[PDB]
């Protein structure tokens, strides 16, 4: 993304213990009065979970 | 979006372009080679010459909706391909000209150049009234000094033909009126386009050649029919022509003249509006579904609005929720036959009745002056009696 | 000749009623005194607006109101009031066009203009559109369905239509158009469009859209939304009682969505139609359980669960008809509906 | 051409930094970012 | 539905401009009766920008994907009554978005077949019943509460925790009004034979001698109350003497309460400060309104002989517990209990919030009259301005 105040292209880093896959990216303009600049985005992560030592059964 | 000199330059430019678009449909329309194209180009090159000179901050150029066709008109006369009334009716009927709406441009952008003071005041403001159209031609000639530059102005033995065929195309009346024209009509010489009426009050010098041609045309008819001592034109013959005349479909032409009638002017065709002979009604809606399709394309009325509009047109699928009609010379032939039985107070009345009709027709294609026309008539009336 | 789809070439007409009003507040004042743009808004603030209808028709039977005034008008007395407002109309006459000087001097003499402002406008787009209007009005005045539809469909494609006759000829043309569409759809599309749930009346110079025949969603009913419900109940009646059904429910839940705000909010047919739809839903269920005791020989059929479902309704309807009366609803001839409903009860026995 | 599907109309579109976040075919205000022909490697486990 | 009974139960909230006029100075005047006649709730809709826009039904799928609440516009027909009827003003006020239960009479999915439900991107079998609040699915947990309207005999050391001369024995009846709002009423047997009645007002507790609430319900003789309790049981020396202590003791405390009306005047006088009825109601009205709002509200208004009979039944049950001729019940036995349903709690909390909201209007009038007193109860401007000056977003 880009904030004019910083004149910089900034990024939101992913902070987690495990890799994932992006399932959906949803662009939210709804319930807004105008908001056309698309300031809200919802991103879904798909984390595969293989049965593993320590999993409860 | 700019004011002053450079606003004017693009105002200028846009005017530049639409005329060019006008000219090329001109070529496809008539197909009269490099010639029609290049003469038109230098004509405006000549027109531009004058605009630059009185520049500084001269903004009188704001040439009108009519200036462009006057330009094409004069260029055509140089060449002398056609006529004015015919050209105008044809153009309105088929929207041949991009004349009436100025959105074409190629400007999307020129539009935004803020139609401001000018470009907004361009393309399609309104339809010509009285002399609001022959006057401009005179002004163009004056700036143009057109008569010196171009040969045989306002001429056309073709307008006479157009006119006789126009209705009671009494083959003999072509030569009759050609003869009276021969007569005192500028000492038996083809009327040339009037001069560069430099003066701004545009007096009715009444030199617009055609205007006088139609006048001689009318005069000829009643004089000719008002002293056909030999009785070559039967009592019952005159009303038959007016009879058969009683409107009728049109292999394109009459439908056009209806479309011109519909500029709701002085109410001579207004009622035709009302009447509108059945189908005339139908082929009218046909020409509306084809030629005000351009109509337009709201941008900036939330996408949502546009969608709604679409839906509306949606739930109105519409457009369909002898080839029948006939051509021009077909109709012309068939009324020429509808009178084919050829071989006191009443006839005078009939003659007056008929003349009013043509007055309607010829006047209706043109700036009329339900008086000037008359004034024009009066004028040569006076001109004539100096035998 | 007919009513045109467009904002009235706002050029001379706007300065003509500057002069009209300004004179009426000038002569209006001195006359009131003896009895001891801006001016136009003040003229309406001295008279009170047109409520949601047409002509402030309201009875003719309450207050006596003694108006013997006294003819109080001695040619001499009129020219005492008038002698000074006319000289004050001059100053702004100097500033007005020669056509508007004569127009003012005609209406100040009491002459009326036989020159319809919509009989001179000379604009291409407008030009035709007046073509457009009379052709469709002359075509519905002879029921030409196949041609009235084409003229209507083109009239909305040109940039000059405010619902207007867009809806009032757009519905019949679809009733006369035995082919495609139920004014209903078009009627429900209109309803979606001009809800106007906002209570806007008065204030500015409504001279672009007056006809309470478009507008509302405030208080002033919309009449295409009332016609949508009336056409919808008549669309439910045809070939009912001679899952894919739903319509008489669709209309019970589409009227619900409302339940007053603007429509519920305002009374009448809103309540009365909803009921009438509800009363029809009561008959249909007496028929579907009517003929020769329900269908025939008795019901044994778990006695009647169906009678109890119908008596609940009949008792409910009578509540909707009553609240429509109580809240000032003059629409309903109660005597006939109560007799019909009781004689119908006597079918359910 | 980047793609965004209308959550309620399925209509494909190509949003710009200059347009309203809305389905031009329905009017919804929720748009799924479309998958494209893009390479991804996978360990088949 | 229950909610319209609730707003019928909140009644009125009256405020006087001290209505000057210059009896109009010790009876003054100009009444303003504010209430709510109807309360309507509409199914979730969303119109674009702001107004004039065509509305669309809003679906739960939208709220979840959008991560937002699933709100329905809350509307209520406000009654603004001036001078008991000199002028009535109706107003449908929108009170913000009330979260609606799924598959309820307020969810679009209430009547959708699985096929349509799938057509709306839902679990083909979605039971619903829960709320989308800020996109997070929450349901209101059902709760186990005392079975309503029926006296449960309880021994509780709290009863001694009231003070000296308190026994453990006591009766608890949880009277619930039609609207499902509850009011717990307790009877206590004092060691002294005195019986005191516990109740709660403005969620503070209040104790009154039961013989006062008896003489307050209906005009009766002492023999009618005595006969009401012991009746044919003329052999209970235990009860004969305790009940003589009760009635004679009341004759000791209040020799001057000679008739029921006077008693009502005593109750109105002692609760007038807290029942907020003042500058409008007489001690007779305040007292009787108290009885009507507290004592066995499950019996309802004008049940005052019936409420009298029931209260006597609780006195008899209480003495039968005291002797020990009957066991006490167990509040924790499922036997003695009913279930506060989430939606009912919802309706109660709405009723209370609308009561506070009308009180809030009353506060707004108080501030306006205390800084200007500029405007009369009649102004339509006053309705619009005052209404626009209190906060009415109860939906949020
Ligand atoms: Zn869509």
Curated annotation (Swiss-Prot), chain B:
Full-protein positions shown: 94 to 512 of 514
Keyword Transmembrane appears in the UniProt entry: no
Note: Present with 398 molecules/cell in log phase SD medium.
Protein name, UniProt field: RNA polymerase I-specific transcription initiation factor RRN7
Organism: Saccharomyces cerevisiae (strain ATCC 204508 / S288c) (Baker's yeast)
Function comment: Component of RNA polymerase I core factor complex (CF) that acts as a SUA7/TFIIB-like factor and plays a key role in multiple steps during transcription initiation such as pre-initiation complex (PIC) assembly and postpolymerase recruitment events in polymerase I (Pol I) transcription. Binds rDNA promoters and plays a role in Pol I recruitment. After binding of UAF (upstream activation factor) to an upstream element of the promoter, CF is recruited in a SPT15/TBP-dependent manner to form a pre-initiation complex.
GO molecular function, one term: RNA polymerase I core promoter sequence-specific DNA binding
Keyword DNA-binding among UniProt keywords: yes
Domain notes: Although it shares weak sequence similarity with SUA7/TFIIB, displays a similar subdomain organization as SUA7/TFIIB, with a N-terminal zinc finger, a connecting region (composed of B-reader and B-linker regions), followed by 2 cyclin folds.
Lineage: Eukaryota, Fungi, Dikarya, Ascomycota, Saccharomycotina
Biological process according to GO: nucleolar large rRNA transcription by RNA polymerase I
GO cellular component: nucleolus; nucleus; RNA polymerase I core factor complex
Localization terms from the record: Nucleus, Nucleolus
Domain of life assignment: Eukaryota
From Swiss-Prot, chain C:
Recorded GO MF terms: RNA polymerase I core promoter sequence-specific DNA binding; RNA polymerase I general transcription initiation factor activity; TBP-class protein binding
BP terms from Gene Ontology: nucleolar large rRNA transcription by RNA polymerase I
One GO term describing the cellular component: nucleus
Keywords, in A-Z order: Nucleus, Transcription, Transcription regulation
Protein localization: Nucleus, Nucleolus
Pfam family, any one: Rrn11
Principal location: nucleus
Alphabetical list of InterPro entries matching this protein: RNA_pol_I-specific_init_factor (IPR053029), TIF_Rrn11 (IPR007224), TIF_Rrn11_budding_yeast (IPR016850)
Miscellaneous note of the record: Present with 476 molecules/cell in log phase SD medium.
Function per UniProt: Acts as a component of the core factor (CF) complex which is essential for the initiation of rDNA transcription by RNA polymerase I. After binding of UAF (upstream activation factor) to an upstream element of the promoter, CF is recruited in a SPT15/TBP-dependent manner to form a preinitiation complex.
Subunit text: Component of the core factor (CF) complex, which consists of RRN6, RRN7 and RRN11. The CF heterotrimer may further dimerize to form a hexamer. RRN11 interacts with RRN6, RRN7 and SPT15.
Name of the protein in question: RNA polymerase I-specific transcription initiation factor RRN11
UniProtKB/Swiss-Prot annotation, chain D:
GO function terms (MF aspect): DNA binding; DNA-directed RNA polymerase activity; zinc ion binding
Gene Ontology CC: cytoplasm; nucleolus; nucleoplasm; nucleus; peroxisome; RNA polymerase I complex; RNA polymerase II, core complex; RNA polymerase III complex
ZnF C4-type span: 6-26
Keyword Nucleus in record: yes
Binding site for Zn(2+): 6, 9, 23, 26
Subcellular location: Nucleus, Nucleolus; Peroxisome
Family, similarity comment: Belongs to the archaeal Rpo12/eukaryotic RPC10 RNA polymerase subunit family.
Subunit structure: Component of the RNA polymerase I (Pol I), RNA polymerase II (Pol II) and RNA polymerase III (Pol III) complexes. Component of the RNA polymerase I (Pol I) complex consisting of 14 subunits: RPA135, RPA190, RPC40, RPA14, RPB5, RPO26, RPA43, RPB8, RPA12, RPB10, RPC19, RPC10, RPA49 and RPA34. The complex is composed of a horseshoe-shaped core containing ten subunits (RPA135, RPA190, RPB5, RPO26, RPB8, RPB10, RPC10, RPA12, RPC19 and RPC40) where RPA135 and RPA190 form the DNA-binding cleft.
Additional remark text: Present with 907 molecules/cell in log phase SD medium.
Identification of the protein by name: DNA-directed RNA polymerases I, II, and III subunit RPABC4
Swiss-Prot record, chain E:
Keywords on record: Acetylation, DNA-directed RNA polymerase, Metal-binding, Nucleotidyltransferase, Nucleus, Phosphoprotein, Ribosome biogenesis, Transcription, Transferase, Zinc, Zinc-finger
Gene Ontology BP annotations: nucleolar large rRNA transcription by RNA polymerase I; ribosome biogenesis; termination of RNA polymerase I transcription; transcription by RNA polymerase I; transcription elongation by RNA polymerase I; transcription initiation at RNA polymerase I promoter
GO cellular component: mitochondrion; nucleus; RNA polymerase I complex
Keyword Zinc-finger: yes
Places the protein is found: Nucleus, Nucleolus
GO molecular function: DNA binding; DNA-directed RNA polymerase activity; ribonucleoside binding; zinc ion binding
Leader sequence residues: none
Subunit structure: Component of the RNA polymerase I (Pol I) complex consisting of 14 subunits: RPA135, RPA190, RPC40, RPA14, RPB5, RPO26, RPA43, RPB8, RPA12, RPB10, RPC19, RPC10, RPA49 and RPA34. The complex is composed of a horseshoe-shaped core containing ten subunits (RPA135, RPA190, RPB5, RPO26, RPB8, RPB10, RPC10, RPA12, RPC19 and RPC40) where RPA135 and RPA190 form the DNA-binding cleft. Outside of the core, RPA14 and RPA43 form the stalk that mediates interactions with transcription initiation factors and newly synthesized RNA.
Similarity comment: family membership: Belongs to the RNA polymerase beta chain family.
UniProt-recorded name of the protein: DNA-directed RNA polymerase I subunit RPA135
Gene from which the chain derives: RPA135
């Amino acid at each position: 993304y880009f904030d004019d105040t910083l004149n910089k292209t900034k990024i939101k880093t992913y902070h987690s213990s495990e890799p994932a896959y992006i399932e959906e990216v949803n662009l939210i303009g709804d319930e807004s009065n105008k908001f056309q600049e698309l300031q809200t985005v919802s991103i879904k992560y798909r984390i595969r979970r293989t049965p593993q030592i320590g999993d409860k059964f | 979006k700019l004011i002053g000199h450079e606003a004017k330059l693009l105002f200028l430019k846009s005017f530049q372009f639409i005329l060019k678009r006008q000219i090329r449909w001109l070529i496809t329309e008539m197909r009269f080679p490099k010639e029609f194209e290049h003469v038109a180009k230098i004509i405006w090159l000549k027109i531009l010459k004058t605009i630059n000179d009185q520049p500084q901050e001269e903004l009188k150029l704001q040439l009108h909706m009519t200036s462009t066709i006057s330009i094409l008109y004069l260029a055509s006369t140089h060449l002398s391909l056609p006529v004015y009334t015919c050209d105008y009716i044809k153009w309105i009927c088929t929207a041949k000209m991009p004349y009436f709406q100025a959105s074409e441009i190629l400007p999307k952008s020129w539009r935004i150049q803020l139609p401001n003071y000018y470009v907004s005041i361009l393309e399609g403001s309104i339809s010509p009234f009285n002399g609001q159209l022959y006057n401009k031609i005179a002004l163009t000639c004056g700036m143009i000094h057109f008569k010196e530059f171009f040969n045989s102005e306002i001429s056309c033995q073709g307008l006479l033909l157009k006119l006789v065929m126009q209705c009671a195309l009494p083959p003999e009346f072509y030569f009759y009126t050609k003869q009276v024209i021969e007569f005192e009509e500028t000492d038996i010489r083809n009327l040339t386009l009037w001069e560069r009426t430099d003066e701004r009050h545009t007096g009715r010098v009444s030199n617009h050649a055609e205007l006088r041609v139609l006048s001689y045309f009318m005069l000829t008819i009643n004089w000719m029919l008002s002293f056909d001592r030999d009785r070559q034109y039967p009592l019952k013959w005159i009303l038959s022509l007016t009879e058969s005349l009683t409107q009728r479909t049109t292999t394109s032409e009459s439908i056009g003249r209806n479309i011109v009638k519909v500029v709701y002017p002085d109410k001579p065709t207004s009622s035709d509006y009302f009447q509108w002979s059945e189908e005339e009604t139908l082929e009218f809606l046909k020409w509306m579904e084809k030629q005000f399709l351009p109509t337009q394309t709201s941008m900036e009325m939330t996408i949502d609005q546009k969608i709604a509009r679409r839906k509306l047109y949606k739930i109105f699928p519409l457009d369909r929720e002898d080839t029948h009609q006939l051509t021009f010379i077909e109709d012309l032939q068939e009324r020429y036959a509808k009178q084919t039985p050829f071989f006191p107070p009443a006839r005078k009345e009939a003659i007056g009745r008929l003349l009013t009709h043509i007055a309607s027709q010829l006047l209706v294609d043109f700036a009329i002056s339900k008086e000037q026309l008359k004034d024009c008539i009066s004028r040569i009336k006076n001109a004539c009696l100096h035998r | 000749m007919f009513e045109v789809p467009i904002t009235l070439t706002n050029r001379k007409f706007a300065q003509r009623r500057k002069l009209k009003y300004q004179y009426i507040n000038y002569i209006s004042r001195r006359f009131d005194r003896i009895s001891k743009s801006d001016e136009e808004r003040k003229f309406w603030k001295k008279y009170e607006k047109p409520e949601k209808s047409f002509e402030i028709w309201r009875t003719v039977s309450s207050q006596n109101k003694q108006p013997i005034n006294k003819q109080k008008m001695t040619y001499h007395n009129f020219k005492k009031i008038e002698k000074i407002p006319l000289r004050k109309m001059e100053i702004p006459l100097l500033h007005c066009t020669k056509e508007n000087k004569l127009y003012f001097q005609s209406i100040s003499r009491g002459l009326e203009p036989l020159k319809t402002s919509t009989s001179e406008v000379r604009n291409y787009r407008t030009r035709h559109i007046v073509t457009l209007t009379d052709l469709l009005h002359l075509n519905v005045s002879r029921h030409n369905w196949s041609l009235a539809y084409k003229i209507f469909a083109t009239l909305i494609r040109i940039p000059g239509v405010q619902i207007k006759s867009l809806w009032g000829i757009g519905v019949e043309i679809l009733d006369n158009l035995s082919n495609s569409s139920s004014g209903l759809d078009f009627l429900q599309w209109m309803c979606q469009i001009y809800s106007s749930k906002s209570r806007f009346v008065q204030n500015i110079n409504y001279r672009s859209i007056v006809p309470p025949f478009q507008t509302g969603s405030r208080t002033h009913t919309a009449k295409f939304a009332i016609t949508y419900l009336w056409s919808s109940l008549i669309n439910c009646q045809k070939s009912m009682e001679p899952t894919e059904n739903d319509l008489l429910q669709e209309l019970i839940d589409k009227i619900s969505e409302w339940v007053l705000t603007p429509p519920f909010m305002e009374d009448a047919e809103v309540w009365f139609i909803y009921a009438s739809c509800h009363l029809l839903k009561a008959d249909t269920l007496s028929r579907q359980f009517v003929n020769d005791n329900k269908n025939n020989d008795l019901i044994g059929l778990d006695r009647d669960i169906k009678i109890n479902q119908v008596i609940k309704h009949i008792h409910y309807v009578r509540t909707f008809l009553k609240i429509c009366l109580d809240k000032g609803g003059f629409a309903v001839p109660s005597r006939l509906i109560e007799n019909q409903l009781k004689s119908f009860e006597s079918r359910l026995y | 051409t980047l793609k965004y599907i209308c959550a309620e109309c399925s209509s494909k579109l190509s949003l710009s930094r200059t347009d309203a976040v809305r389905c031009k075919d329905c009017g919804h205000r929720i748009l799924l970012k479309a998958r494209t022909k893009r390479l991804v490697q996978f360990e088949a486990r | 539905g229950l909610l319209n009974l609730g707003v019928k139960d909140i009644g009125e909230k009256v405020i006087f401009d001290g209505k000057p006029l210059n009896s109009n100075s010790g009876y003054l005047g100009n009444k303003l009766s504010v209430s709510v006649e109807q309360v309507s709730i509409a199914k979730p809709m969303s119109n674009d920008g702001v107004s004039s826009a065509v509305e669309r039904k809003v679906y739960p799928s939208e709220s979840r994907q959008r991560l937002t609440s699933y709100r329905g516009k809350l509307l209520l027909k406000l009654k603004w009554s001036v001078n008991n009827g000199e002028e009535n003003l109706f107003e449908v006020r929108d009170c913000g978005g009330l979260p609606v239960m799924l598959q309820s009479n307020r969810c679009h999915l209430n009547k959708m077949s699985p096929y349509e439900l799938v057509q709306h991107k839902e679990e083909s079998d979605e039971i619903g019943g829960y709320f989308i609040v800020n996109g997070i699915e929450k349901l209101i947990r059902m709760l186990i509460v005392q079975r309503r309207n029926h006296p449960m005999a309880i021994i509780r050391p709290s009863f001694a925790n009231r003070g000296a001369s308190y026994s453990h024995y006591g009766i608890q009846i949880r009277s619930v009004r039609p609207d499902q709002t509850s009011q717990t009423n307790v009877l206590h047997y004092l060691n002294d034979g005195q019986v005191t009645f516990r109740f709660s007002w403005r969620k503070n507790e209040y104790l009154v001698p039961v013989v006062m609430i008896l003489k307050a319900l209906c005009h009766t003789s002492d023999r009618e109350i005595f006969d009401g309790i012991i009746g044919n049981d003329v052999k209970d020396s235990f009860l004969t003497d305790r009940l003589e202590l009760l009635l004679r003791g009341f004759k000791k405390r209040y020799p001057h309460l000679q008739n029921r009306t006077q008693v009502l005047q005593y109750l109105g006088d002692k609760f007038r400060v807290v029942f907020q009825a003042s500058p409008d109601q007489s001690d007779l009205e305040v007292g009787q309104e108290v009885l009507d709002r507290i004592v066995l509200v499950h019996l309802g208004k004008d049940g005052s002989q019936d409420k009298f009979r029931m209260l006597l039944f609780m006195i008899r049950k209480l003495y039968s517990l005291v002797a020990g001729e009957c066991s006490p019940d167990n509040p924790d036995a499922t036997q003695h209990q009913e279930v506060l349903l989430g939606g009912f709690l919802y309706g109660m909390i709405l009723k209370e919030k609308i009561d506070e909201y009308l009180q809030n209007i009353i506060a707004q009038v108080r501030m306006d009259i205390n800084r200007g007193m500029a405007i009369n109860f009649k102004d339509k401007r006053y309705m619009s301005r005052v209404l626009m000056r209190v906060n009415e977003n109860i939906g949020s």
